[PDB]
Amino acid sequence: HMADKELKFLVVDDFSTMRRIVRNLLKELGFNNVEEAEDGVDALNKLQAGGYGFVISDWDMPNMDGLELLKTIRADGAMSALPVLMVTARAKKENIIAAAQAGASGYVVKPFTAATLEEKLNKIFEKLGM
Ligand code: MOO
Ligand SMILES: [Mn+2]
Protein backbone atom coordinates (compact mmCIF):
# COMPACT_ATOMS: atom_id res chain seq x y z
CA HIS A 1 0.00 0.00 0.00
CA MET A 2 0.86 3.70 0.43
CA ALA A 3 1.85 5.72 3.50
CA ASP A 4 -1.51 7.45 3.73
CA LYS A 5 -3.96 7.55 6.62
CA GLU A 6 -5.45 4.22 5.53
CA LEU A 7 -2.24 2.13 5.80
CA LYS A 8 -3.04 -0.74 8.17
CA PHE A 9 -0.42 -1.64 10.78
CA LEU A 10 0.08 -4.73 12.83
CA VAL A 11 1.89 -4.17 16.10
CA VAL A 12 3.36 -7.30 17.61
CA ASP A 13 4.80 -7.66 21.10
CA ASP A 14 4.18 -10.02 24.03
CA PHE A 15 3.90 -7.03 26.42
CA SER A 16 0.86 -4.71 26.34
CA THR A 17 2.86 -1.68 27.45
CA MET A 18 5.18 -2.00 24.44
CA ARG A 19 2.27 -2.33 21.98
CA ARG A 20 0.57 0.66 23.59
CA ILE A 21 3.67 2.81 23.06
CA VAL A 22 3.77 1.96 19.35
CA ARG A 23 0.02 2.36 18.81
CA ASN A 24 0.03 5.81 20.42
CA LEU A 25 3.05 6.92 18.41
CA LEU A 26 1.31 5.79 15.21
CA LYS A 27 -1.83 7.71 16.18
CA GLU A 28 0.25 10.87 16.67
CA LEU A 29 1.70 10.33 13.17
CA GLY A 30 -1.81 10.10 11.79
CA PHE A 31 -2.18 6.31 11.48
CA ASN A 32 -5.34 5.07 13.22
CA ASN A 33 -5.83 1.83 11.32
CA VAL A 34 -3.86 -0.28 13.77
CA GLU A 35 -4.22 -3.83 15.16
CA GLU A 36 -2.21 -5.74 17.76
CA ALA A 37 -0.93 -9.29 18.23
CA GLU A 38 0.77 -10.86 21.23
CA ASP A 39 3.06 -13.31 19.41
CA GLY A 40 4.10 -14.55 15.96
CA VAL A 41 1.22 -17.03 15.56
CA ASP A 42 -1.39 -14.47 16.55
CA ALA A 43 0.31 -12.12 14.05
CA LEU A 44 0.25 -14.59 11.14
CA ASN A 45 -3.39 -15.37 11.87
CA LYS A 46 -4.25 -11.68 11.41
CA LEU A 47 -1.90 -11.17 8.47
CA GLN A 48 -3.38 -14.09 6.51
CA ALA A 49 -6.82 -12.55 7.07
CA GLY A 50 -5.58 -9.88 4.65
CA GLY A 51 -5.43 -6.09 4.34
CA TYR A 52 -2.22 -5.28 6.25
CA GLY A 53 0.38 -2.92 4.85
CA PHE A 54 2.99 -2.74 7.62
CA VAL A 55 4.29 -4.85 10.48
CA ILE A 56 6.09 -3.60 13.57
CA SER A 57 7.41 -6.45 15.67
CA ASP A 58 9.21 -7.39 18.85
CA TRP A 59 11.74 -10.20 18.85
CA ASP A 60 11.56 -12.20 22.12
CA MET A 61 8.02 -13.64 22.26
CA PRO A 62 6.56 -17.02 23.21
CA ASN A 63 4.90 -19.37 20.68
CA MET A 64 6.71 -17.77 17.69
CA ASP A 65 9.42 -15.14 18.14
CA GLY A 66 9.80 -12.12 15.86
CA LEU A 67 12.78 -13.46 13.90
CA GLU A 68 10.73 -16.55 12.95
CA LEU A 69 7.81 -14.23 12.22
CA LEU A 70 9.98 -12.14 9.91
CA LYS A 71 11.38 -15.23 8.15
CA THR A 72 7.90 -16.72 7.67
CA ILE A 73 6.57 -13.49 6.16
CA ARG A 74 9.57 -13.15 3.80
CA ALA A 75 9.23 -16.76 2.57
CA ASP A 76 5.46 -16.57 2.00
CA GLY A 77 4.42 -15.87 -1.59
CA ALA A 78 1.41 -13.76 -0.62
CA MET A 79 3.27 -11.45 1.77
CA SER A 80 6.99 -11.69 0.97
CA ALA A 81 7.30 -7.92 0.40
CA LEU A 82 5.41 -6.73 3.51
CA PRO A 83 7.35 -4.04 5.40
CA VAL A 84 8.57 -5.39 8.77
CA LEU A 85 10.18 -3.04 11.30
CA MET A 86 11.92 -4.86 14.19
CA VAL A 87 11.62 -3.11 17.57
CA THR A 88 13.50 -4.94 20.27
CA ALA A 89 15.83 -4.56 23.24
CA ARG A 90 18.25 -6.94 21.47
CA ALA A 91 21.26 -4.79 20.57
CA LYS A 92 24.07 -7.28 19.85
CA LYS A 93 25.59 -6.91 16.39
CA GLU A 94 24.82 -10.55 15.69
CA ASN A 95 21.11 -10.01 16.48
CA ILE A 96 21.03 -7.04 14.08
CA ILE A 97 22.81 -9.09 11.38
CA ALA A 98 20.46 -12.03 11.79
CA ALA A 99 17.39 -9.77 11.41
CA ALA A 100 18.90 -7.73 8.58
CA GLN A 101 19.88 -10.84 6.64
CA ALA A 102 16.43 -12.36 7.30
CA GLY A 103 15.02 -9.29 5.53
CA ALA A 104 14.05 -6.71 8.16
CA SER A 105 12.96 -3.42 6.61
CA GLY A 106 14.44 -1.64 9.62
CA TYR A 107 15.59 -2.16 13.21
CA VAL A 108 14.94 0.08 16.24
CA VAL A 109 16.46 -0.68 19.67
CA LYS A 110 14.36 -0.33 22.85
CA PRO A 111 14.04 1.98 24.55
CA PHE A 112 13.33 4.40 21.70
CA THR A 113 12.03 7.93 21.30
CA ALA A 114 9.11 9.16 19.26
CA ALA A 115 11.59 10.90 16.95
CA THR A 116 13.52 7.68 16.34
CA LEU A 117 10.40 5.70 15.40
CA GLU A 118 9.19 8.45 13.10
CA GLU A 119 12.49 8.72 11.26
CA LYS A 120 12.91 4.95 10.84
CA LEU A 121 9.36 4.54 9.56
CA ASN A 122 9.93 7.42 7.17
CA LYS A 123 13.19 5.81 6.02
CA ILE A 124 11.25 2.68 5.14
CA PHE A 125 8.43 4.60 3.41
CA GLU A 126 11.00 6.40 1.26
CA LYS A 127 12.92 3.21 0.48
CA LEU A 128 9.74 1.52 -0.72
CA GLY A 129 8.12 4.49 -2.48
CA MET A 130 5.11 4.57 -0.15
O1 MOO B 1 11.22 -9.00 24.09
MO2 MOO B 1 12.55 -8.09 23.20
O3 MOO B 1 13.19 -8.66 21.75
O4 MOO B 1 13.96 -8.54 24.28
O5 MOO B 1 12.38 -6.31 23.45
MN1 LIG C 1 9.20 -9.47 24.10
The resolution, in angstroms to one decimal, equals 2.1
* Strand order across the beta sheet in which 106-109 lies: 34-37, 9-12, 54-57, 84-88, 106-109
Looking at ligand 1, which atom is closest to the CA of residue 14? 1
Least Cα distance to 85 among 67, 106, 102 occurs for 106
38: domain range? 1-130
Q: Which ligand is nearest to the CA of 70?
A: 1
Q: What determination technique applies here?
A: X-ray
Question: Domain containing 20 — which CATH number?
Answer: 3.40.50.2300
Cα 34 from chain centroid? 11
Pocket-testing residue among 57, 59, 85, ligand 1, by greatest number of atoms within 8 A of Cβ: 59
86 backbone dihedrals φ, ψ, rounded to 5°: -80, 135
How many domains are there within the chain?
Answer: 1
Residues having CB within 6 Å of any atom of ligand 1: 58-60, 88-90, 110
User: Which residues fall within 8 angstroms of residue 18, CB to CB, at 6 or more apart?
Assistant: 58, 87, 110
Looking at ligand 1, which atom is closest to the CA of residue 58? 3
